[PDB]
Every structure is written in structure tokens, then in C-alpha cells.
């Protein structure tokens, strides 16, 4: 069987993009995801009926000084729910944008989980993200993680890419 | 008489003056930057 959810309906200068991610189920368990992407070409000003759901890149912020714990406790979107000292934090985060013009936002909802790696390799959540605003121009939560931490990069690219097969064979 | 004039204003009655003035200089530097780096990040978060 198949259940599908729609991710992003955004008005571009080249049209109206539609991304649909349809997760195929089998005996209850999910098997594979199909990330399809369409386009209604033309010009469309329907900024009232557009949105975007993005799963953000996991950013690993490394705390080394003593002012760093003071900063994110001033961030009202951060709320730690435990009295646990922490060295490094990975923020696995998801966002939901709604637009009002071409690059302004009508609303932003940014939630997410913050994570701590213990020395005994157990992962326990320290707290949560709860950001919500209207009529903004960017996401603060991601822009904070854009400069104050590195992304957990899994797509590690080689220095010189190697061709697999060469000639006309293909 | 040879005359010692101890014009030190009571500072010999402070145990471990090195470690005492170290923590007062640290705490005023550690208060100044947490009030800085918060007001730096809260400035740019309003720019976003």
C-alpha cells in the first residue's frame, strides 16, 4: 500500500513547484520513499496558498568557552528540560514555512530535538526547540546554526572523482 | 631610627592576594563577555 504526503508548494519565478514524498508501506512497515517534483509553468501570485516543509540539516554545535551556554539560554527558542552538563550538541531539526511574498515569510514554525552524546555512547535528549513567528525575513534557528556550528556531513566528496566506465559502451 | 613606613592600605591582611585578585579580574571579564556575546547574538537575531 502507499501513503503520500506533500512537502513544498512554492511559487518560483519559473512556476509553481510541487514536491510530493510518497512513502510506500508493506505489511505495516515502510519500505521506500519516492521524492517526486513537478512544476506548473507560468507566473503565479498565489502567496496565500503556498507553504514549505523542510527537514533541516543536523548541525553539531561544539561548545568550548563558558559564554556559549549563556547564549543559547538567552535564545527563547531553546528550552533545555534537564539539569545536565553538555560538551557538544547536535540539533536534528525540522521547519515549516509559509510565505507572504517572494522571499518574505508569513509564518515560521521551527521545532526540533537537541541531542547529547554521552561517553557511554547513550543518546539522551537534553531539550527541545520551539520557535514560532510571523512576518519574518529568515529563519533565526538555522542562521544561528549556520555560523556557530558545523553540519553533520555524511555526503563526503572525493578530491578527484573517478570515472566508472569509459567509451561508448554506455 | 631606620623607619619602615608601611603605607600599604591594609592589603597585608588579605590571604592569597594573587588568587583573590585573579578571580575578581576573571569574574568581571566573564561577566563582560556573556553580556557581550548575548547582545551580539540578540542583535543579529533581530536582523534575521
From Swiss-Prot, chain A:
* Domain of life per record: Eukaryota
- What the protein does? Fatty acid synthetase catalyzes the formation of long-chain fatty acids from acetyl-CoA, malonyl-CoA and NADPH. The beta subunit contains domains for: [acyl-carrier-protein] acetyltransferase and malonyltransferase, S-acyl fatty acid synthase thioesterase, enoyl-[acyl-carrier-protein] reductase, and 3-hydroxypalmitoyl-[acyl-carrier-protein] dehydratase.
Q: Which family does it belong to?
A: Belongs to the fungal fatty acid synthetase subunit beta family.
- Assembly and interactions? [Alpha(6)beta(6)] hexamers of two multifunctional subunits (alpha and beta).
Please report the name of this protein according to its UniProt entry: Fatty acid synthase subunit beta
Parent-record interval covered: 1359 to 1528 of 2037
UniProtKB/Swiss-Prot annotation, chain B:
What is the documented function of this protein? Fatty acid synthetase catalyzes the formation of long-chain fatty acids from acetyl-CoA, malonyl-CoA and NADPH. The alpha subunit contains domains for: acyl carrier protein, 3-oxoacyl-[acyl-carrier-protein] reductase, and 3-oxoacyl-[acyl-carrier-protein] synthase.
Indicate the family of this protein: Belongs to the thiolase-like superfamily. Fungal fatty acid synthetase subunit alpha family.
Instruction: Spell out the subunit comment.
Output: [Alpha(6)beta(6)] hexamers of two multifunctional subunits (alpha and beta).
Name of the protein in question: Fatty acid synthase subunit alpha
Species this chain originates from = Candida albicans (Yeast)
Q: Which start and end residues of the full protein are shown?
A: 920 to 967 of 1885
Amino acid at each position: 500500500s502507499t501513503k503520500a504526503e506533500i512537502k513544498a508548494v512554492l511559487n518560483q519565478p519559473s512556476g509553481k513547484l510541487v514536491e510530493v514524498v510518497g512513502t510506500i508501506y508493506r505489511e505495516g512497515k515502510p519500505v521506500m520513499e519516492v521524492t517526486s517534483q513537478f512544476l506548473y509553468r507560468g507566473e503565479y501570485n498565489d502567496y496565500c496558498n503556498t507553504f514549505q516543509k523542510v527537514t533541516e540539516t543536523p548541525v553539531q554545535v561544539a561548545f568550548k568557552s563558558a559564554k556559549d551556554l549563556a547564549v543559547l539560554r538567552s535564545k527563547e527558542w531553546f528550552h533545555l528540560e534537564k539539569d545536565v552538563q553538555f560538551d557538544v550538541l547536535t540539533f536534528r531539526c525540522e521547519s515549516t514555512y509559509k510565505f507572504k511574498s517572494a522571499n518574505v515569510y508569513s509564518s515560521i514554525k521551527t521545532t526540533g530535538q537537541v541531542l547529547l552524546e554521552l561517553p557511554t555512547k547513550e543518546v539522551i535528549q537534553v531539550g527541545s526547540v520551539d520557535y514560532e513567528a510571523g512576518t519574518s525575513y529568515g529563519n533565526p534557528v538555522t542562521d544561528y546554526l549556520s555560523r556557530n556550528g558545523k553540519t553533520i556531513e555524511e555526503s563526503v566528496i572525493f578530491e578527484n572523482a573517478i570515472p566508472l566506465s569509459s567509451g561508448e559502451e554506455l | 631610627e631606620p623607619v619602615m613606613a608601611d603605607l600599604n592600605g591594609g592589603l597585608q591582611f588579605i590571604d592569597n592576594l594573587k588568587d583573590f585578585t585573579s578571580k575578581l579580574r576573571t569574574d568581571l571579564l566573564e561577566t563582560a563577555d556573556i553580556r557581550r556575546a548575548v547582545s551580539i547574538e540578540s542583535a543579529i537575531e533581530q536582523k534575521v
